[PDB]
From a paper:
The NRPS enzymes that produce the β-lactam antibiotic nocardicin A (1) exhibit several unusual features. In contrast, NocTE is a unique example where a thioesterase domain catalyzes a functionally unidirectional L → D epimerization that expands the known repertoire in nature to achieve this simple but powerful modification. The overall structure of NocTE is similar to known TE domain structures of NRPS and polyketide synthase (PKS) enzymes. The NocTE active site structure with its catalytic triad Ser1779, His1901, and Asp1806 is similar to canonical Type-I thioesterase domains.
To confirm bioinformatic assignment of the catalytic triad, guide mutagenesis experiments and identify additional residues that could play catalytic roles, the structure of NocTE was solved by MAD phasing and subsequently refined against a high-resolution dataset from a native protein crystal. The lid region of NocTE consists of two helices (α4 and α5) that are oriented at an angle of 48° relative to each other and are held together through hydrophobic interactions. Interestingly, positioned two residues downstream from the catalytic aspartate (Asp1806) is His1808, which forms an additional hydrogen bond with the catalytic serine. In the unliganded structure, His1808 adopts two alternate side chain positions; the principal orientation hydrogen bonds to Ser1779. In the unliganded structure, the only contact made by the α4 helix to the core domain is through the backbone carbonyl of the Glu1829 to Arg1903 side chains. The loop joining the β6 strand and α4 lid helix, residues Arg1815–Glu1821, is missing in the NocTE unliganded structure. In the unliganded structure, a fourth water is present that is positioned near the β-lactam carbonyl oxygen. The NocTE active site is a fairly open channel allowing entry of solvent molecules at the active site as revealed in the NocTE unliganded structure. The crystal structure of NocTE confirmed the assignment of His1901 and Asp1806 in the catalytic triad with Ser1779, and additionally identified potential catalytic involvement by His1808.
Author numbering: 1695 to 1814, 1822 to 1923
Protein backbone atom coordinates (compact mmCIF):
# COMPACT_ATOMS: atom_id res chain seq x y z
CA UNK A 1 0.00 0.00 0.00
CA UNK A 2 0.75 3.73 0.15
CA UNK A 3 1.92 3.38 3.74
CA UNK A 4 4.58 0.73 3.04
CA UNK A 5 7.64 2.04 1.22
CA UNK A 6 10.60 -0.20 0.31
CA UNK A 7 14.12 1.27 0.10
CA UNK A 8 17.13 -0.49 -1.44
CA UNK A 9 14.72 -2.93 -3.17
CA UNK A 10 17.49 -4.95 -4.88
CA UNK A 11 19.58 -5.41 -1.72
CA UNK A 12 20.50 -9.00 -0.89
CA UNK A 13 21.96 -8.80 2.62
CA UNK A 14 18.74 -9.12 4.52
CA UNK A 15 15.69 -6.95 5.20
CA UNK A 16 14.75 -4.62 8.06
CA UNK A 17 11.24 -3.32 8.79
CA UNK A 18 11.14 0.09 10.45
CA UNK A 19 7.97 1.44 12.11
CA UNK A 20 7.37 5.20 12.15
CA UNK A 21 8.04 7.20 15.31
CA UNK A 22 5.30 9.02 17.16
CA UNK A 23 4.91 11.63 14.45
CA UNK A 24 3.49 8.93 12.24
CA UNK A 25 5.57 9.25 9.06
CA UNK A 26 8.41 6.98 8.14
CA UNK A 27 10.20 9.75 6.18
CA UNK A 28 13.05 10.29 8.72
CA UNK A 29 14.26 6.80 7.84
CA UNK A 30 14.73 7.50 4.11
CA UNK A 31 18.21 8.90 4.71
CA UNK A 32 19.28 5.60 6.17
CA UNK A 33 19.01 3.84 2.83
CA UNK A 34 22.28 5.00 1.23
CA UNK A 35 23.98 4.30 4.55
CA UNK A 36 22.62 0.74 4.79
CA UNK A 37 23.03 -0.27 1.15
CA UNK A 38 23.03 -3.98 1.85
CA UNK A 39 19.63 -3.91 3.63
CA UNK A 40 16.17 -3.92 2.05
CA UNK A 41 14.39 -1.34 4.20
CA UNK A 42 10.59 -1.60 4.50
CA UNK A 43 9.40 1.56 6.26
CA UNK A 44 5.87 1.76 7.62
CA UNK A 45 3.76 4.89 8.05
CA UNK A 46 0.53 5.25 10.06
CA UNK A 47 -2.42 4.62 7.72
CA UNK A 48 -4.72 6.50 10.11
CA UNK A 49 -2.55 9.63 10.08
CA UNK A 50 -5.03 11.98 8.57
CA UNK A 51 -8.10 10.62 10.32
CA UNK A 52 -9.34 12.29 13.46
CA UNK A 53 -11.87 9.45 13.41
CA UNK A 54 -10.87 5.81 13.05
CA UNK A 55 -7.68 5.87 15.09
CA UNK A 56 -6.24 2.56 16.23
CA UNK A 57 -7.84 1.66 19.60
CA UNK A 58 -4.65 0.17 21.07
CA UNK A 59 -0.99 -0.24 20.26
CA UNK A 60 -1.73 -3.95 19.93
CA UNK A 61 -4.27 -3.31 17.13
CA UNK A 62 -1.76 -1.12 15.29
CA UNK A 63 0.90 -3.78 15.60
CA UNK A 64 -1.49 -6.50 14.35
CA UNK A 65 -2.21 -4.45 11.23
CA UNK A 66 1.50 -3.81 10.59
CA UNK A 67 2.28 -7.52 10.90
CA UNK A 68 -0.14 -8.09 8.06
CA UNK A 69 1.78 -5.66 5.88
CA UNK A 70 5.10 -7.25 6.84
CA UNK A 71 3.92 -10.72 5.86
CA UNK A 72 2.63 -9.36 2.54
CA UNK A 73 5.95 -7.71 1.79
CA UNK A 74 8.25 -10.47 3.05
CA UNK A 75 6.24 -13.74 3.00
CA UNK A 76 9.25 -15.69 4.35
CA UNK A 77 11.32 -15.01 7.44
CA UNK A 78 13.36 -14.67 9.45
CA UNK A 79 12.27 -11.12 10.23
CA UNK A 80 14.17 -8.12 11.52
CA UNK A 81 12.01 -5.32 12.95
CA UNK A 82 12.70 -2.06 14.68
CA UNK A 83 11.85 1.61 15.05
CA UNK A 84 12.85 4.93 16.57
CA UNK A 85 11.26 5.67 19.96
CA UNK A 86 7.48 4.87 19.68
CA UNK A 87 8.17 2.83 16.53
CA UNK A 88 10.50 0.54 18.46
CA UNK A 89 7.72 -0.12 20.98
CA UNK A 90 5.31 -1.07 18.15
CA UNK A 91 8.04 -3.24 16.62
CA UNK A 92 8.38 -5.06 19.93
CA UNK A 93 4.69 -5.84 20.07
CA UNK A 94 4.88 -6.94 16.43
CA UNK A 95 7.75 -9.27 17.28
CA UNK A 96 5.81 -10.57 20.27
CA UNK A 97 2.82 -11.40 18.04
CA UNK A 98 4.83 -12.88 15.17
CA UNK A 99 6.84 -15.17 17.41
CA UNK A 100 3.67 -16.30 19.15
CA UNK A 101 2.46 -17.36 15.69
CA UNK A 102 5.52 -19.31 14.76
CA UNK A 103 7.70 -16.78 12.97
CA UNK A 104 11.42 -16.33 13.59
CA UNK A 105 12.32 -12.72 14.50
CA UNK A 106 16.12 -12.75 14.50
CA UNK A 107 16.58 -9.07 15.43
CA UNK A 108 14.47 -6.37 17.15
CA UNK A 109 15.95 -2.88 17.12
CA UNK A 110 14.68 -0.36 19.65
CA UNK A 111 16.32 2.93 18.71
CA UNK A 112 16.29 4.86 21.99
CA UNK A 113 12.75 3.65 22.80
CA UNK A 114 11.15 4.05 26.25
CA UNK A 115 8.35 2.13 27.98
CA UNK A 116 6.01 4.93 29.05
CA UNK A 117 3.63 2.61 30.86
CA UNK A 118 6.42 2.02 33.38
CA UNK A 119 8.55 5.18 33.27
CA UNK A 120 6.28 8.00 31.85
CA UNK A 121 6.83 18.90 24.12
CA UNK A 122 4.26 17.92 21.44
CA UNK A 123 4.44 21.33 19.75
CA UNK A 124 8.08 21.93 20.82
CA UNK A 125 9.21 18.84 18.85
CA UNK A 126 7.93 20.36 15.61
CA UNK A 127 9.41 23.74 16.39
CA UNK A 128 12.69 21.79 16.85
CA UNK A 129 12.09 20.10 13.43
CA UNK A 130 11.46 23.53 11.84
CA UNK A 131 7.70 23.03 11.18
CA UNK A 132 5.03 25.46 12.22
CA UNK A 133 2.83 23.54 14.69
CA UNK A 134 -0.06 25.68 13.44
CA UNK A 135 0.50 25.04 9.70
CA UNK A 136 -1.59 22.34 7.96
CA UNK A 137 1.20 19.80 8.48
CA UNK A 138 1.71 21.03 12.02
CA UNK A 139 -1.68 20.32 13.54
CA UNK A 140 -1.93 16.81 12.07
CA UNK A 141 1.45 15.92 13.41
CA UNK A 142 0.76 17.11 16.93
CA UNK A 143 -2.57 15.24 16.87
CA UNK A 144 -0.88 12.07 15.64
CA UNK A 145 1.81 12.45 18.29
CA UNK A 146 -0.49 12.81 21.22
CA UNK A 147 -2.60 9.83 20.24
CA UNK A 148 0.44 7.58 19.70
CA UNK A 149 1.75 8.72 23.07
CA UNK A 150 -1.59 7.68 24.59
CA UNK A 151 -1.34 4.26 22.84
CA UNK A 152 2.10 3.80 24.34
CA UNK A 153 1.05 4.89 27.85
CA UNK A 154 -1.75 2.26 27.92
CA UNK A 155 0.55 -0.51 26.61
CA UNK A 156 2.78 -2.69 28.74
CA UNK A 157 5.54 -4.55 26.86
CA UNK A 158 5.46 -8.28 27.51
CA UNK A 159 8.31 -10.53 28.42
CA UNK A 160 10.06 -11.31 25.11
CA UNK A 161 12.83 -13.89 24.78
CA UNK A 162 14.24 -13.14 21.36
CA UNK A 163 17.26 -10.96 20.64
CA UNK A 164 16.56 -7.25 21.35
CA UNK A 165 18.99 -4.42 20.64
CA UNK A 166 18.28 -1.24 22.62
CA UNK A 167 20.28 1.68 21.21
CA UNK A 168 20.61 4.35 23.94
CA UNK A 169 21.58 7.98 23.80
CA UNK A 170 23.43 9.52 26.78
CA UNK A 171 21.48 9.24 30.02
CA UNK A 172 21.14 12.25 32.31
CA UNK A 173 23.64 11.80 35.17
CA UNK A 174 24.91 8.57 33.53
CA UNK A 175 22.32 6.43 35.33
CA UNK A 176 21.34 2.87 34.27
CA UNK A 177 20.10 3.31 30.73
CA UNK A 178 17.69 0.36 30.75
CA UNK A 179 15.73 1.24 33.89
CA UNK A 180 15.81 4.95 32.98
CA UNK A 181 13.75 4.07 29.88
CA UNK A 182 11.29 1.83 31.78
CA UNK A 183 12.54 -1.54 30.58
CA UNK A 184 13.05 -4.59 32.78
CA UNK A 185 15.94 -6.87 31.93
CA UNK A 186 14.04 -9.74 33.60
CA UNK A 187 11.56 -9.48 30.68
CA UNK A 188 14.26 -9.13 28.00
CA UNK A 189 16.75 -11.93 28.77
CA UNK A 190 18.48 -11.56 25.37
CA UNK A 191 18.75 -7.76 25.47
CA UNK A 192 21.91 -6.14 24.11
CA UNK A 193 22.46 -2.47 24.95
CA UNK A 194 24.30 -0.37 22.37
CA UNK A 195 25.26 3.32 22.47
CA UNK A 196 24.13 5.88 19.88
CA UNK A 197 25.31 9.52 20.23
CA UNK A 198 23.32 12.74 20.31
CA UNK A 199 19.87 13.72 21.54
CA UNK A 200 16.80 11.47 21.43
CA UNK A 201 14.88 13.84 19.10
CA UNK A 202 17.84 14.56 16.84
CA UNK A 203 18.84 11.00 15.92
CA UNK A 204 17.75 11.18 12.27
CA UNK A 205 18.60 14.74 11.39
CA UNK A 206 21.35 15.55 8.88
CA UNK A 207 24.23 15.81 11.38
CA UNK A 208 23.42 12.60 13.28
CA UNK A 209 22.30 10.24 10.55
CA UNK A 210 25.70 8.73 9.85
CA UNK A 211 26.37 7.93 13.52
CA UNK A 212 22.82 6.57 13.99
CA UNK A 213 23.24 4.39 10.85
CA UNK A 214 26.58 3.16 12.22
CA UNK A 215 24.89 2.07 15.46
CA UNK A 216 22.12 0.29 13.51
CA UNK A 217 24.63 -1.49 11.29
CA UNK A 218 26.55 -2.65 14.37
CA UNK A 219 23.34 -3.82 16.09
CA UNK A 220 22.33 -5.95 13.10
CA UNK A 221 25.78 -7.54 12.68
CA UNK A 222 25.84 -9.29 16.08
Amino acid sequence: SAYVHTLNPEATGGALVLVHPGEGLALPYHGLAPLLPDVRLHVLSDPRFGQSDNRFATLAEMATRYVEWVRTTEPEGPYRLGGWSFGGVVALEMASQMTAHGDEVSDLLLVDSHNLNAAPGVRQRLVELGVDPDSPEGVDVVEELLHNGALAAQYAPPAYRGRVSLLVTPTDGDRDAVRARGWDRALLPDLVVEPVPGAHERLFDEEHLSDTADAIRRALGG
